[PDB]
Design a protein around this ligand. Structure first.
Ligand SMILES: [O-][O-]
Ligand SMILES: [O-][O-]
Ligand SMILES: [O-][O-]
Ligand SMILES: [O-][O-]
Ligand SMILES: [O-][O-]
Ligand SMILES: [O-][O-]
Lengths: 197, 197, 197, 197, 197, 197, 197, 197, 197, 197
């Protein structure tokens, strides 16, 4: 069963049950057309790096919505395990309330479509996908289990894609808002390389 | 032809001609055993984001070498084109001298083995790979063409993997050195969750 | 992927992580050679009929051990979800403590080997298997999700198999301990049919 | 040739000759639409557990008919052998007159469609199937040859499915009519768990 | 599954349980090596032409034994049905005691091997086979269901094959013991033909 | 090339050149619709058992024609050899003039169609087929080469079929015209079995 | 099944029963090693051109024996028909006695190996083969049915082939013994073409 | 690639360039419809037997035209070699002028269609075909290289085939015009065999 | 993937980005319809024989244009490398301004289509192709890496094909404009050959 | 049958009959090891461009032999046609006596091995191959039929290869003996490119 997630192609469609504001709702990738989506997998509810990452994105959710960007998290756990996790206090590795949908990939179909399913473990690694508003996949970040992801880096990449979507100039290594960009032409490129070093 | 690059498996072997310090030398993935390796692809010599990524890394090479980590870059261009690029002043979108190897992948074999090859274009996307001292692939970062990578994020990741190798603990979202870590078990985990609240 | 569970054949081998007396232990089907095992699947932790069944068997576990019979339960949930379920009080649909291993079938491999995996739902139906001490599968009970199983019936079947294992006489409809049995021979059968009605 | 019998799918269609009230009649699964059906296989006419199961059910037929439920039995024997069996006094391991149909499966087609056929023996094992009024298969009970089934368990099951059809609630372990039921959702479920404790 | 029965080839091997003198004995084709065997199939116990054929051969069995010839009958019925049939008085279409083995072919393998099986009915047609003391198949007689076979004709054939086995002669149309035979060569044949005419 | 001759299915169609009344005529199985047909193969013209069988049937043809039955013979010999044999005196092993058609099967298509062809010998064995007036195969008699068939047995068989065709009673072993028949149902079978025999 | 007759390749091996001076003898191709063999097929015994050819050859058999050549005729007809045809006076289209073996090919395998079999007719055409003392096929003459072959032409060819075997020189169009030959080289060819011709 | 030359079937179609009276003309098999055609292959231009045959035929071409027959020779040689061979004096192994078309088969397809191609030699053997006015193949003569063909035999055959076409009677062995023929039926065959012969 | 380049067949279609007069233009084979095209591959920008060949043709380009002939060069290098090569002074192995299109074949499709690709090296050998105004491929010249091509020879060939295109003549060895030509038929050819000698 | 001729791999092995010094000799590619070999195919003997190419090379053979080079010619014509052409005066389009071997490829195996065979015409096109002393193919020149090759260009090519073989410098476009060469590295390439040209 092959990974269908390819950069510059439509992100593999998905649909399933998620926990949104304490309730079970059906959620579809297509529900986010018009916005940038940060769609990310994490291994297991009731473990360790996993609460911290969901909390880090949830706590800073306004930074994303402020740039027309939603966030959705997902693991192979059921919607009932998600809801129990949410209902466990952060003190006991629970999540406590949260502002980001927790999608359920019980059948493992979505994980396989995104190429993050670990056949020997029965869950995903840490895979994060940045999908733009046309539904096109733009970025893929895959981390071995031990190492969590970074909201700042994710923020930077979304802003970079939105910028380059708007202007057609390109974003140099380390680019942040306000940084120099490059006209992607053999002559126009010299406005950047000549100006700075 | 399919990507052989899988997290927690040995990175796909490669060898080829690289420009090292103005000279052609035969470089092998295995020459880096014993050290961490940031192995990264970029589209085309004499383009745009491309020099700025190589420069960014090369110019900060010591922040990697000071943590037992090397950096190698790669494109489908020939070694002759790499050298001419290096021999082009930075002011014209050249690299000027550079301390990180430029590996050449004319046959596209390496790009295909790493699953970064773009069939419709004849070059790669922005693909970065973090390979540990034991040769195991730990992190995969893939960017669509317009958006460059970040030396700082790469550094944070390398540091995180080195930490969790050493202490067998796990790094939460956004972990930078000095940040709180977690002990991977339902019991001992609570010394972090009763501490962050 | 075909069901390997066939009556009068060795029960499909399994191994995985279970929660035994609050801890993660590796458990193997073979660990129960010498005893009758009641091995049963249930859909999801943090649901409804599922706690009641585990509780019904756990509370009456001594009735099984007293006849050389162990009980193991299993669902597609992780060992971390199991342990959280156990650590949720029975008042909130939790299990509270329990004396029966909760096996984890995260990869779905065991469920598929036993032919209880629901491809569209991502979990099992209510399947119960009675495996004797030689490791041979003797009985299969499969219930659609809404309807729970019965400890009394399970008790009856185990006793019936143990009896018939010992004596070679056969167990008539409705048989319980102390009931009439039948010599499985065209002549010897008449000691039963002649004697009663 | 594989079993077509799947829980929550329409029971595999069958038809054939049955002895009904001393006569040969053509019986179809579809003749039972509108009623629940206990459809059960047994090994061989003129054997042992076999008459006692048929008698047990037939003699208690009204406990099923009083709840809109029929009972049909089946073996690989011919209709001529079924009738001769019925025409054998119970005192000789016959059935004497019987009110439940004996379906004949000489071609083994039905036994194979239900996955109860024993290739090495040329007859079935003890297989029982509970099919609802809409024709959907709800319960599968398979016994190795020495051990008979239970009318009481069958009755409890039929009653349970009829209840959960009507009230869309779910039946806990051991549910007999009049027992507490559960409302299937993480909220309303607690009116049973805060009640049983 | 195709007929393995070929004239002048060794008769297809067979074995199974038979009722020999009211007892269940295991019977193999090879047990009859050294004697001629009349091996015949009939459709169903407790039917019509069927008892009369077994009886006809059973009553005249010494005529066969006195020429080193055995007789075995076979149907798809179980050995248990065979025995009940034997224990049924002839006046009710039973067989009463019988000296011919009744072989059971529940699995339908023997019938398929002898190409006498009816897929649409689930039992055999009227097939009879004459197998010599070397186990070579010599004669195949197949009748549609409603016409019974002939003991007289069967005897004549056995005698003729025994005859042509012992002598360098062939048996003309209608040959019975005592009749003119032919020497099978162009010269010797004329001692028969000139004489006859 | 496998045999198309199945009992109670239409007899494999055939056509070819037959010697009739000294002349070559085209002859077709369908020419015999409305009549019963005894169609039989024999090995080789100018052999031994062969002419006696053709003569036995020819000389007694009226016993067949007076019961709406024809007889046709066939071997792999050419029509010219057939004729040459017919023009050989009976005393030299010829047929002399003959009243039954001799069909020619040089290509072996017909023999192969009837499963009577010997691949190792290049001619048929002794195969006789009884085809009713509706063209349905009713009976197959196959003899190894050394033993001729019987006109008396063939007559009995033809009469038996004609009779069950007409009366829908069935024929017991050894049934000759005027013998007791049986009504084919489990109740009317007692007319024949009680005191009647 | 394809033809194996290839010029300058070994003639396809054959064996079978033949009529040699009124007797049935097994005959092998390898029996003629050392001698030249004219090997011809004819359509059918008891027909037309076919007798005249065999006689035409058989009468002049001496001219072949005085040049180390043997002859064998073959048809699809049985040995028994062959013998009958010989014992038929020439005046009635028979052969009368004959020195030329008549080989029998009932199975058709020999005709098929020699590419002379007529699938639609069931016998061969007029096919003649010239085989040298070392068993290599040297000549193939195939005639449509209506036209017979020539003893003289066959004699010319056998001689031509014998001459070129010895002298290693080549035979021009229309070569009969004593005629002028040609030396097979572009120098020694002028001896024939120039001054002489 | 297999031979398509089949007697009594249409001669395989052909076309190509030929040398007809010093000129290059496309030539088709269908060009000879209405006339008999002797069509022969020869190994090579500028060799040995090959010129004598073409001359042998070409000189006597009249005897073929006075019986409605044409002739065409063919080799694997190019038209340019054909023409050069014609413009080579007969005294130097040339043909000198010639009335017989020399067909060219450079591609070898025609030789392969006629089964005369020698795979190991790269040219044909001595193969001759007689084709009637309706384009049906009537005769195939194949010679090994060293032996040439006979104008007289070819003439006998063309006449024989023309006679049997008209009169519908058959030609005995060694038939030249005016000779006694045979009527193709077992009655009218006695006119030839009896009293006359 | 096999070479599609066949002489006298239409040249394999191609398109891609080329540097035409310092700009990136999209170029198709079909753009040259109506003119002759010299289409040539060279191994690598910034190498050795490579600049000299492009220069040689570039400098003498009017000699081609003045005969309705274009020239295009192609390597596996990117259009960006092409432009930098053009912008590199000839004194450092660059091309300086160039009037010949430089076509880019990054995907290797065009090179594979023209069978000039080296799988082991990742670039082409020295392949040159002459394509006429109808787009038919007329000439293929392939050189191993170390030997350069000849503008003079290339011109002679283009002129010769143009010549033989316009006139019913062929060009002998070494032909240049002005030289003797040959009339390609057996008669007319002699005006050339008798004259020359 | 695909072409085996690959540049810088060993030249497809070949062997056959060649006309040498008026006589037929067996000739093998390996006979030329140690020498460079110009091996070239031409369409057809007795055509037009063909003799001029053979004559041009033959008459200037010493220019090849004085540089350790041989020349061999080959077409699909037979060795007898080769000879006949050699014995044709140059004034009639013949070769007259000749000093280069004329190889014969009647079976086309050699032409096919070299990818020069025209399936539609049955002869080759104008294909020339330059094989070094180590038997490695160095150069392939293929011309459509109307244009002859050049002895001067072939000489240049042979000299170029001999020179790079010897000096390990590379040959620029139009290199003739005594012209400037280039050292094949990115630094020593400046010796040739600066002021040197
Ligand atoms: O350059 O992106
Ligand atoms: O009978 O079990
Ligand atoms: O008799 O069926
Ligand atoms: O003939 O038997
Ligand atoms: O020149 O490579
Ligand atoms: O011959 O061109």
């Amino acid at each position: 069963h092959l990974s269908k997630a390819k950069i510059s192609k439509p992100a593999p469609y998905w649909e399933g049950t998620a926990v949104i504001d304490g309730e079970f709702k059906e959620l579809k990738l297509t529900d986010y057309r018009g916005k940038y989506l940060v769609f990310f997998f994490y291994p297991l509810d009731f473990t360790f790096v996993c609460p911290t990452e969901i909390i880090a994105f949830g706590d800073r959710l306004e930074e994303f919505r402020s740039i027309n960007t939603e966030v959705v998290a997902c693991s192979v756990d059921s919607q009932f395990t998600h809801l129990a996790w949410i209902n466990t206090p952060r003190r006991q590795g629970g999540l406590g309330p949260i502002r980001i949908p927790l999608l359920s990939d019980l059948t493992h179909q979505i994980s396989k479509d995104y190429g993050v399913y670990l056949e020997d473990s029965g869950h995903t690694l840490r895979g994060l996908f940045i999908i733009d508003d046309k539904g096109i996949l733009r970025q893929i970040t895959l981390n071995d289990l031990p190492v969590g992801r970074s909201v700042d880096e994710t923020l930077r990449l979304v802003q970079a894609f939105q910028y380059t979507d708007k202007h057609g100039e390109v974003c140099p290594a380390g680019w942040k808002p306000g940084s120099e960009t490059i006209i992607p032409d053999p002559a126009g490129k010299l406005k950047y390389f000549d100006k700075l070093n």
